[PDB]
Amino acid sequence: NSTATLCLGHHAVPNGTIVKTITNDQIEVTNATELVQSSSTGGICDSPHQILDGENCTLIDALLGDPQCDGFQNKKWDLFVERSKAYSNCYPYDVPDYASLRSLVASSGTLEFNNESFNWTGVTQNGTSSACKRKSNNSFFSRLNWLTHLKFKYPALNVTMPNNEKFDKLYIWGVHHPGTDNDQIFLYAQASGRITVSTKRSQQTVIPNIGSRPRVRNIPSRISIYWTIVKPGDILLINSTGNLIAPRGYFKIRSGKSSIMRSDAPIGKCNSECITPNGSIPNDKPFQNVNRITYGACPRYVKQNTLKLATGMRNVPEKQAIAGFIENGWEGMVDGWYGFRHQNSEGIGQAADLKSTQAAINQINGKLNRLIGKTNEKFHQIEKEFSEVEGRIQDLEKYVEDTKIDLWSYNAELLVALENQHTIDLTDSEMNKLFERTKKQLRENAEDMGNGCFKIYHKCDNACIGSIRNGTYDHDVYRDEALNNRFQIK
Amino acid sequence: NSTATLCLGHHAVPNGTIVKTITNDQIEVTNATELVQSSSTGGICDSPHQILDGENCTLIDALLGDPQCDGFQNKKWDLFVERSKAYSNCYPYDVPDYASLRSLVASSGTLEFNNESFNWTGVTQNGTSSACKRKSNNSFFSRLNWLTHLKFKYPALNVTMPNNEKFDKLYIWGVHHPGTDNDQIFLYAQASGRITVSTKRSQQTVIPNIGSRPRVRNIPSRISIYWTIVKPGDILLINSTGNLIAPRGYFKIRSGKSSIMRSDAPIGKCNSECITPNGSIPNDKPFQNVNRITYGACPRYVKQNTLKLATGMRNVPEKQAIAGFIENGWEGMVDGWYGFRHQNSEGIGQAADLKSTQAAINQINGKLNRLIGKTNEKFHQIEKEFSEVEGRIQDLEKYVEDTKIDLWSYNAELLVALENQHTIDLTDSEMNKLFERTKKQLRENAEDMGNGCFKIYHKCDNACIGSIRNGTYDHDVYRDEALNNRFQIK
Amino acid sequence: NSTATLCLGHHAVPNGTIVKTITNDQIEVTNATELVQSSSTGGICDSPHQILDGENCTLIDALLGDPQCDGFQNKKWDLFVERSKAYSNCYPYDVPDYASLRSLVASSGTLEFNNESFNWTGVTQNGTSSACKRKSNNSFFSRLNWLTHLKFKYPALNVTMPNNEKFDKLYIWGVHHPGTDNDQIFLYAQASGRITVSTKRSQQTVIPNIGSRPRVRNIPSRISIYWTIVKPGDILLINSTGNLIAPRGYFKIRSGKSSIMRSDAPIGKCNSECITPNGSIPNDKPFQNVNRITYGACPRYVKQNTLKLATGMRNVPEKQAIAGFIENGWEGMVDGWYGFRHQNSEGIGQAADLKSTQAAINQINGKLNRLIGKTNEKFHQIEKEFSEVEGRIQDLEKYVEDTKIDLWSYNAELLVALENQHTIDLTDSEMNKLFERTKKQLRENAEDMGNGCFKIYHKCDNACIGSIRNGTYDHDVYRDEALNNRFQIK
Ligand SMILES: *[C@@H]1O[C@H](CO)[C@@H](O[C@@H]2O[C@H](CO)[C@@H](O[C@H]3O[C@H](CO)[C@@H](O)[C@H](O)[C@@H]3O)[C@H](O)[C@H]2NC(C)=O)[C@H](O)[C@H]1NC(C)=O
Ligand SMILES: *[C@@H]1O[C@H](CO)[C@@H](O[C@@H]2O[C@H](CO)[C@@H](O[C@H]3O[C@H](CO)[C@@H](O)[C@H](O)[C@@H]3O)[C@H](O)[C@H]2NC(C)=O)[C@H](O)[C@H]1NC(C)=O
Ligand SMILES: *[C@@H]1O[C@H](CO)[C@@H](O[C@@H]2O[C@H](CO)[C@@H](O[C@H]3O[C@H](CO)[C@@H](O)[C@H](O)[C@@H]3O)[C@H](O)[C@H]2NC(C)=O)[C@H](O)[C@H]1NC(C)=O
Ligand SMILES: *[C@@H]1O[C@H](CO)[C@@H](O[C@@H]2O[C@H](CO)[C@@H](O)[C@H](O)[C@H]2NC(C)=O)[C@H](O)[C@H]1NC(C)=O
Ligand SMILES: *[C@@H]1O[C@H](CO)[C@@H](O[C@@H]2O[C@H](CO)[C@@H](O)[C@H](O)[C@H]2NC(C)=O)[C@H](O)[C@H]1NC(C)=O
Ligand SMILES: *[C@@H]1O[C@H](CO)[C@@H](O[C@@H]2O[C@H](CO)[C@@H](O)[C@H](O)[C@H]2NC(C)=O)[C@H](O)[C@H]1NC(C)=O
Ligand SMILES: *[C@@H]1O[C@H](CO)[C@@H](O)[C@H](O)[C@H]1NC(C)=O
Ligand SMILES: *[C@@H]1O[C@H](CO)[C@@H](O)[C@H](O)[C@H]1NC(C)=O
Ligand SMILES: *[C@@H]1O[C@H](CO)[C@@H](O)[C@H](O)[C@H]1NC(C)=O
Ligand SMILES: *[C@@H]1O[C@H](CO)[C@@H](O)[C@H](O)[C@H]1NC(C)=O
Ligand SMILES: *[C@@H]1O[C@H](CO)[C@@H](O)[C@H](O)[C@H]1NC(C)=O
Ligand SMILES: *[C@@H]1O[C@H](CO)[C@@H](O)[C@H](O)[C@H]1NC(C)=O
Ligand SMILES: *[C@@H]1O[C@H](CO)[C@@H](O)[C@H](O)[C@H]1NC(C)=O
Ligand SMILES: *[C@@H]1O[C@H](CO)[C@@H](O)[C@H](O)[C@H]1NC(C)=O
Ligand SMILES: *[C@@H]1O[C@H](CO)[C@@H](O)[C@H](O)[C@H]1NC(C)=O
Ligand SMILES: *[C@@H]1O[C@H](CO)[C@@H](O)[C@H](O)[C@H]1NC(C)=O
Ligand SMILES: *[C@@H]1O[C@H](CO)[C@@H](O)[C@H](O)[C@H]1NC(C)=O
Ligand SMILES: *[C@@H]1O[C@H](CO)[C@@H](O)[C@H](O)[C@H]1NC(C)=O
Ligand SMILES: *[C@@H]1O[C@H](CO)[C@@H](O)[C@H](O)[C@H]1NC(C)=O
Ligand SMILES: *[C@@H]1O[C@H](CO)[C@@H](O)[C@H](O)[C@H]1NC(C)=O
Ligand SMILES: *[C@@H]1O[C@H](CO)[C@@H](O)[C@H](O)[C@H]1NC(C)=O
Ligand SMILES: *[C@@H]1O[C@H](CO)[C@@H](O)[C@H](O)[C@H]1NC(C)=O
Ligand SMILES: *[C@@H]1O[C@H](CO)[C@@H](O)[C@H](O)[C@H]1NC(C)=O
Ligand SMILES: *[C@@H]1O[C@H](CO)[C@@H](O)[C@H](O)[C@H]1NC(C)=O
């Protein structure tokens, strides 16, 4: 007796987790948290973004006014969702640069349409087809006007529509390509000639081309769709002698945050900021491996399926007399991260050190706050999956996205390694600081035993040990006793 | 008496600045410097890049030779500046793929034009229009030759121009689209037919299309502009029966560092390496938030409006007997960053430690030198602002630039946090090293009081203290005295 | 006598290497390794990727079936290598969107072709030209069928080919543009009319255009090449009255990892994973400055020509009595990185410390293992060099690649600086840890002399010194002797 022991230590847990640092590929820590979101519910939540489920209609079918899409008239969206089951059920058509028209309508986010009174003096309006039935009757695209001859005449059309509004107008129109010369004459009363649609700033001339194409819904003819945007103070001029599928008015074109996504995920009554084709995903984590296609406030796509961020210190087994932190953790330390164990006249005890514990916890929570719940919003982007082979432009779209993903995946990998190294360093540092402060209090009254413990060379009862732990130990009170015990001749 | 005190310390300032590190969102340091350039003068400096102010002319108007652009003939530039007020004042035209022709001329950086003698036997040359007045007379684009019938004949043209030069030739030509069939006959004496312009490696066939477009400067006709590059040893062949707006020669096409920028900033007589649409900006800082559009040696565009780099240590208030660096800075320390305070027989004093101060300053200046004045040059890039809706290609251009900016903004954020953490570490380290070296000199003659000070257990006058500070203190001289004082029984 | 000295130290080498850290632009370390691959052998190794050397043929010439390319029929590749000497030797042709057709065939990786029996009732098949000789006879592209009139009739063709297969079909076809009206009549017996090639999902109409182009291999006519992909359950329909260069069947179109590269490097019998235009390169290093164009498992392209990664500690000259690590390295320490030197009754000695040496070496090898031999594979990408001026799309392709390279170059620069700082820190740390452990063993029996050495205040013979070095020194055995020597009055 006449001496006491005081050990400094830190906790350890039975169920640690492996993380990666700069120093170590694999190091066990007491706790970690996942930074890559890897699952979705599988449903797209209908809140807080305005979702429009296309059901059997593509956006372009909804635009033109396919009868099955009549329910979509004038609707708006943040996200238009196109289904793989979607199919057209009207006159067969193509759109040169379909992808662009789809994109610009998607981004505009509205199907608002304003009817206008075009002067079609001299032709028959409202042509119909058995290939486009509406309520069991022969019909046509709602937003288009199939003009045909009147009394076997089709006068040369030269029709104007000024934009006297403060906003832009989007006009959608078409050219009919009849399957045969018989159809050409039956419909327009004369041989086919070019169609020219112009403004002060633009001109588009299109040549109708007679001929059979493979029948689609029993139709060998085609309609080719074109568009023209007309600015305030400009004028639409339409010049034709036949084959014109005419506009009935204009679409409003807006700018904002709207987009389109291909998905078969069901739409749920729930609330989630981040939408992917697989369904909505939580956006607490900074990264995700669910889908490169996203809409809203979303984690960034990375290639990794897991990245673990340390949220506690190195986890060190307890060695099997009391002993301190040197190659030794304390599994019995459960009310703190760092603490003291002592042996004195009155027994062997343990107490947590609150200051050091809280300093480590605060710093860890600091970095969690920078990384958790901090995702940023993206809206209309580029397409990232393709159903047809196209070459150059598609090669570029793919390479852009590959490039981006690899750079983010590298950033994620480095960030987590750096953060984890910093966490191991800051938690190791709190242990070292606690030891050093204790060493300083004890002055000449103790010696360092090399194992994270001090040999205190005087009687140091429970109150004395408490004084060291609360930082009120007065070394002068004990120095005489201690020096005599230390520097005695044995 | 019979003892002295020696404290180690570091400076502190009354007006510190907040920075971000890896450890802390907000930590006050003694000084910092801004790494994001956020202002411009508002003028584009005319030095050291060769600036060409388009004034009322676009590059394309200057190319074709609109009369108001006659002053631009044969000029070169590093940067062509196009003004929002620019307007065309000649025959109305369009350019299929205007953006590409604009880009390739801009990048070439020259309007040098070499006249050639084309053999236009059988037609009238030099047609003019009241829509394109030059010096009050009817005229036309300077670089183009409006051919019309001769004696009411327009023979089929089949005209050749070999490239026997060592460099490439850029040919600009056009097709006239008359407003009516009357104009077609009045000008070319016959019905319109295709124009074919070919080389050994290329062919472009264009169909003139008669019809009224909305009048522009009272003209319902149009000219569509095309271009053809002809290689050394190749040959231009022009084949037409009318409607040909012919070239008068070729433009030199160069390769180099030239570009074009849309800006309304006035041009100043001043010198600045980095140009943005907002005006020139200083390029000392590594980052900038003025404009994503830049030309020359420019900071990189980031989203942040400020990033502060620490250029001094943690700023710690002085606690209100002398005391050392432990939770305590020295506001009275003004001739150094680190130093010594002492109490002895002769009073209380302070002296700066030059070595430690200079070590910290040098390292900080080291990192300033890597980051300040080190910008790199970019020249012709992609467009980043768009006046029309286009869909797919524009979506890709935008996404490429968004992607780039977010990656750089992340790099900037991480770099500054890392550098700041390193600065806090290196400045803390110089303090700790100074304490340790002093501790080592004193040997058994002093004890650490826990507050950044030593209790020296012998009389230590001003010269003795100086000896410790200059590193020449001989502990053996004082050991006997010191040991007696330390290990006395009180 | 009655004392001993024990110094802790670390090795130093006569031939150190300069590296960059976060702290220092230039710091000498004992060893480093290069992370940028800067040379190639200059040959493309024929293993392990399937190489197809185009020799005198482009891919497109091999596709169409130019006679000099007959050897390529039905071949597959991972990498098709196109030579700058390649030239066409058949009928002159162009391909609108040549780059896309080249890319999609390259990416598909196969020239497998399946003949089909088209019903060409009413025309002459197998037209030939003296411009396309095969085995000295007039011939034509192997995969194309030049149809001409039969008995001075050319009936309107309306020919079908269903896809009843489970895979897609790629059809290549053409339109002949005769030099004169005489040739048109001689070949097709009538005036030229449009050609329409259609499916259920697509239509392409092309207008043959009569006229002389500059003679190529004495031919003023041209063939323009087009392609059509036909899906399972779809049907190809060809509709023409002349000028049709017909398909003889279809190409298989596959998806996989194939690509094309322009290179003049000879092909060698050797094995290398990474191919560049300059030749194959080793892929041990994480970065390379040989070529931005790569195929296979390749280091990432960066702008730097060298980045040195530290693989040893700071290299410190030996100062010219034994001395420890403080501003002092040990050039005579050759069997370890860290160790002990001593002076005692029995002489002066040196021994390496294995634990500390191995801890540093292991960590360094750890980071080498993460960076060396870990390259990732890329296959078909975008083009990165261009022989013609094109404007907008090329500007984007270039900017995408510039952007990527600058971001990777920054990542490389930062990574190496960070790693090197960490290596200096971990090697410095092993030295400091060894000193501290020794200090702890010695307890009150030694004093720190400030130069990396302890003065041990008792007789400490070779076995005693060994006990300290193996960590079995019992301080209690010597304490009485040591305390008497330390705290004597001199
Ligand atoms: C050019 O060739 C085409 C393909 O051979 C051909 O299309 C085919 O036309 C037939 C005849 O009408 C269609 O067959 C239909 O026959 C009866 C007619 O009463 C219908 O009741 C059936 O529904 C049956 O389908 C084919 O469907 C059609 N084939 C394709 C692939 O579309 C064109 O008619 C030809 N064009 C010309 C101008 O001759
Ligand atoms: C097809 O329709 C066009 C638009 O309605 C029409 O253009 C318009 O033509 C008129 C008549 O020339 C122009 O009006 C001008 O009238 C007198 C004529 O002496 C002039 O002095 C005035 O300057 C006045 O502007 C319109 O300017 C013009 N409108 C537009 C929008 O360009 C075409 O003429 C029609 N084309 C055909 C072939 O009939
Ligand atoms: C339109 O102009 C073209 C260029 O002037 C012209 O092409 C040239 O045609 C001549 C005549 O055939 C070729 O010259 C050849 O002359 C003899 C004919 O026996 C040959 O043996 C020689 O090989 C010699 O080359 C030129 O080669 C050719 N020039 C070019 C650049 O192709 C067209 O013929 C003209 N077209 C029309 C319809 O008149
Ligand atoms: C554009 O409209 C004008 C009429 O304003 C058309 O010109 C007329 O065409 C008819 C029949 O082709 C001719 O008989 C008339 O002589 C023309 N009138 C005038 C005033 O020139 C013109 O054809 C239309 N263009 C197109 C491509 O359909
Ligand atoms: C290209 O030039 C040739 C003349 O070298 C044109 O061919 C002549 O065209 C006229 C009028 O159309 C005919 O009467 C002659 O018989 C043609 N001459 C020959 C030698 O064929 C040809 O039309 C021009 N092509 C174009 C598109 O304008
Ligand atoms: C596509 O094929 C059809 C035949 O199936 C062509 O139509 C015939 O064309 C000839 C000559 O031009 C006419 O005499 C016949 O009256 C047409 N037959 C029918 C049934 O209409 C048609 O011309 C072809 N199209 C093209 C562009 O070549
Ligand atoms: C582990 O870390 C996370 C994030 O700080 C925390 O929410 C969780 O409660 C911790 N788990 C344990 C067992 O401490
Ligand atoms: C979509 O089409 C399918 C199959 O034709 C049909 O059964 C279903 O009811 C349609 N859904 C809607 C909303 O019209
Ligand atoms: C409609 O067009 C014709 C031109 O053919 C014109 O004469 C008529 O007045 C127009 N009707 C209007 C403007 O109501
Ligand atoms: C065309 O149809 C619409 C109803 O869809 C009708 O309001 C309009 O009067 C019709 N016009 C003519 C000329 O039949
Ligand atoms: C998301 O869907 C894609 C296909 O679009 C699939 O590759 C991926 O595995 C999905 N991820 C899930 C369901 O977690
Ligand atoms: C603080 O110190 C007192 C005596 O100074 C000691 O008895 C006690 O254990 C310490 N802690 C608390 C919470 O009172
Ligand atoms: C703060 O730091 C900058 C950059 O080193 C320096 O130029 C400036 O003089 C410093 N300011 C003060 C008050 O020390
Ligand atoms: C540009 O045009 C404006 C308005 O027409 C004119 O006042 C001004 O003088 C022009 N500037 C030049 C340099 O021609
Ligand atoms: C110009 O062109 C005609 C072809 O119509 C030719 O006959 C004449 O010789 C040419 N003049 C020259 C080459 O000076
Ligand atoms: C055409 O105009 C230019 C002056 O701009 C003149 O040099 C040339 O001789 C003219 N040619 C003819 C045929 O009038
Ligand atoms: C630079 O100009 C852009 C518009 O081009 C503007 O958004 C930005 O605020 C400007 N920055 C300045 C003047 O600092
Ligand atoms: C250096 O040491 C001397 C005595 O050794 C002392 O008097 C003095 O204060 C110190 N500094 C200078 C600059 O002389
Ligand atoms: C230097 O480092 C490399 C990589 O660890 C190693 O292979 C090489 O043997 C080392 N060279 C020396 C002289 O130690
Ligand atoms: C390629 O062409 C050259 C020059 O015409 C010829 O000498 C060589 O033999 C050709 N090579 C092959 C493989 O045909
Ligand atoms: C080939 O084409 C003709 C159409 O002109 C057809 O009548 C004939 O039967 C066809 N031959 C076949 C299918 O063998
Ligand atoms: C066309 O040529 C091929 C050989 O290349 C032959 O098999 C086929 O019978 C020929 N057909 C005709 C109609 O001459
Ligand atoms: C690789 O080839 C390119 C040209 O394609 C050249 O710029 C570069 O110097 C080459 N690098 C070598 C041979 O190391
Ligand atoms: C280990 O210690 C023994 C005595 O304890 C000493 O003699 C020896 O030098 C040390 N090393 C080895 C390898 O025996």
SS3 per residue for B38-55: CCCCCCEEEECCCEEECC
Q: Which of chain A's residues have a Cβ under 8 Å away from the Cβ of C380?
A: 395
Among C100, C160, C198, select the one facing A390 at the smallest CB separation: C100
- CB burial of residue C14 (10 Å; 0-12, 13-18, 19+): exposed
* Interatomic CA distance for residues A8 and A350, integer angstroms: 10
* Burial class of A279 by CB neighbour count within 10 A (0 to 12, 13 to 18, 19+): buried
Which residue among A212, A391, A414 sits closest to C101, beta carbon to beta carbon?
A391
Task: Considering only the beta carbons, identify the residue of B203, B239, B367 that sits closest to C94.
Answer: B203
The two tokens of residue C119 are 């019903």
Distance of CA B340 to the CA centre of its chain: 47
Q: How far is Cα B353 from Cα C79, in angstroms, rounded to an integer?
A: 66
Rounded distance between C-alpha atoms, residue A395 and residue A386, angstroms = 11
Q: What is the DSSP letter of C69?
A: G
B466 CA to centre of ligand 18 in angstroms = 5
Residues C294 and B408: their CA atoms lie apart, in Å, by 25
Token readout for B159 is: 């005209």
CB atoms within 10 A of CB C305: 9
- Ligand 13 mean position, distance from CA B315 (Å): 14
The answer to whether A350 and A332 have CB atoms below 8 angstroms apart is yes
DSSP H helical ranges for A65-224:
98-108, 181-188
Q: For the CA atoms of chain C, what is the radius of gyration?
A: 38
The closest of B471, B399, B401 to B442, measured between CA atoms, is B471
Cβ C222–B203 below 8 Å, yes or no? Answer: yes
The closest residue, in CA terms, to atom 34 on ligand 3 is C212
Separation CA B476–CA B445 (nearest Å): 9
Query: Which of B25, B211, B486 has its CB closest to that of A196?
Result: B211
Q: How far from the centroid of its chain's Cα atoms is residue A353's Cα? A: 42
Contact assessment for residue C148 and residue C123, using Cβ atoms and an 8 Å cutoff: yes
Please give the Cα distance from B242 to B224 (Å, whole number): 14
DSSP classification of residue A387: S
**In B178-234, beta strands by DSSP E:** 195-198, 203-206, 222-230
Cβ contacts of residue A235 below 8 Å, gap of 6+? A160, A161, A162, A163, A199, A200, B214
Interface test with C, best of A399, A404, A483 (most C CBs within 10 A): A399
Q: Which of A31, A284, A420 to mutate to test the pocket of ligand 7 (most atoms within 8 A of CB)?
A: A31
DSSP helix/strand/coil, C172 = strand
Q: Output the 3-class SS for C413-468.
A: HHHHHHHHHHHHHHHHHHHHHHHHHHHHHHHHHEEECCCCEEEECCCCCHHHHHHH
Residue pair A203/B214 in contact by the 8 Å Cβ criterion: no
Instruction: Please list, in sequence order, all residues whose beta carbon lies within 8 angstroms of the beta carbon of residue A449, skipping any fewer than 6 positions away.
Output: A5, A324, A455
Torsion sign across C-alpha atoms B281, B283, B285, B291: positive
* Lookup result for tokens 């019992």: C474
Amino acid at B238: I
- The closest ligand to the CA of B121 turns out to be 15
The total of other beta-carbon atoms located within 10 Å of residue C291's CB is 19
**What is the three-class DSSP state of C314?**
strand
Tokens standing for residue B200: 């050994």
Determine phi and psi for C246, rounding to 5 degrees.
Answer: -90, 150
Contact B454, B460 (CB under 8 A): no
DSSP single-letter state for residue C345: T
Angle at A285 (CA atoms; ends A280, A291), nearest 5 degrees:
45
What is residue C67's DSSP assignment?
Answer: G
Distance CA B335, CA B354 (A): 9
- Name the A residues in 420-459 with CB < 8 Å from any B CB: 422, 426, 437, 440-441, 443-444
Residue C422 is nearest to which of A22, A392, A448, comparing CB atoms? A22
Residue A20, helix vs strand vs coil: coil
Alpha helices (H) in C142-260, listed in sequence order: 181-188
The values of phi and psi at residue C267, to 5°, are -95, 125
Distance CA B19, CA C234 (A): 65
Structural element, H or E, at residue B244: strand B244-247
Which CA distances in Å does C116 have to C76, C111, C212?
A: 21, 16, 34
Which stretches of C307-353 are assigned E, i.e. beta strand?
308-310, 338-344, 347-352
CB A338 within 8 A of CB A434: yes
For residue A198, the ligand closest to its alpha carbon is 2
- Domains observed in chain C: 1-49+266-490 (3.90.20.10), 50-265 (3.90.209.20)
* Residue in the structure block whose two tokens are 């257990």: B457
For residue A287 the two structure tokens come to 């990264």
Strand pairing partners for B447? B455
Assess whether the C-beta atom of C125 lies below 6 angstroms from ligand 22.
Answer: yes
Cβ-count burial A140-171 (b if 16+ within 10 Å, e if not): bbbbbbbbbbeeeebeebebebebeeeebbbb
CA of B31 to the centre of ligand 13 (A): 6
* Cβ atoms of C103 and A395 closer than 8 Å: yes
A418 vs B: CB within 8 A: yes
Ligand nearest to the CA of A115: 10
Determine the Cα–Cα distance for residues C96 and B154; give it in Å rounded to an integer: 31
Q: What Å distances lie between residue B102 and B62, B95, B356, C328, CA to CA?
A: 11, 10, 59, 65
What is the biggest distance separating any 2 CA atoms in chain C, rounded to whole angstroms? Answer: 133
Best mutation target, A3, A20, A21, A22, to test chain C (most C CBs within 10 A): A22
Phi, psi for residue B14 in degrees, rounded to 5: -75, -25
Distance CA C466, CA C105 (A): 73
Report resolution (Å) to 1 decimal: 1.9
Q: Count of CB atoms within 10 A of residue A388's CB?
A: 11
Residue contact C366–A24, C-beta within 8 A: yes
CB distance C200 to C234 below 8 Å: yes
Instruction: List the structure tokens of C140.
Output: 């034509």
Q: Give the determination technique.
A: X-ray
Sequence-distant contacts of B408-412: CB under 8 A, at least 24 apart: B408/B287, B408/B300, B408/B301, B408/B302, B408/C407, B409/B302, B409/B303, B409/B304, B410/A411, B411/C407, B411/C410, B412/B35, B412/B36, B412/B286, B412/B287, B412/B300, B412/B302, B412/B304, B412/B307
Chosen from B216, B392, B406 to mutate, greatest number of chain A CBs within 10 A: B392
A97 touches chain B (CB under 8 A): yes
The 8 Å CB, 24+ separation contacts for B408-413 are: B408/B287, B408/B300, B408/B301, B408/B302, B408/C407, B409/B302, B409/B303, B409/B304, B410/A411, B411/C407, B411/C410, B412/B35, B412/B36, B412/B286, B412/B287, B412/B300, B412/B302, B412/B304, B412/B307, B413/B304, B413/B307
CA angle centred on C216, ends C213 and C222, rounded to 5°: 50
Q: CA angle at residue B190 from B187 to B193, to 5 degrees?
A: 100
Which residues numbered 329-358 in B keep a CB inside 8 Å of some CB on A?
none
Alpha-carbon distance B225 to A181, whole Å? 35
Residues in the ligand 18 pocket, defined by CB under 6 Å: B 463, 466-467, 470, 472
User: What subunits make at least 3 CB pairs under 8 angstroms with C?
Assistant: A, B
Closest Cα in chain A, distance from residue B271 (Å) = 37
Helices (H), C24-175: 59-64, 98-108
Partner C, chain B 217-246, Cβ-Cβ below 8 Å: 229, 234-235, 237, 239
CA-to-CA distance for A412 and B20, rounded, in angstroms? 20
Give every CB contact of residue B145 below 8 A, 6+ residues apart in sequence: B118, B120, B125, B126, B127, B245, B246, B247, B248
Rounded Cα gap, residues A266 and C145, in angstroms: 51
Q: What residues are in contact with ligand 20 under a 6 Å CB criterion?
A: C 55-56, 68
List CB contacts of A285: < 8 A, sequence separation 6 or more: A34, A35, A36, A37, A299, A372
Q: Which of C118, C119, C154, C239 to mutate to test ligand 21, by most ligand atoms within 8 A of the CB atom?
A: C119
- How far, in Å, CA of B312 to CA of B326, rounded? 18
- List, in sequence order, every beta strand (DSSP E) within B345-452: 347-352, 376-378, 446-448
Query: Where does residue B119 rank: exposed (0-12), middle (13-18), buried (19+ CB within 10 A)?
Result: exposed
Q: How far apart are CA C278 and CA B400, in angstroms?
A: 29
Helix (H, G, I), strand (E, B) or coil at C482: helix
Report the DSSP beta bridge partners of residue C402.
none
Residue pair C312/C294 in contact by the 8 Å Cβ criterion: no
Length of chain C: 490
Q: Is the CB of B100 under 6 A from ligand 16?
A: no
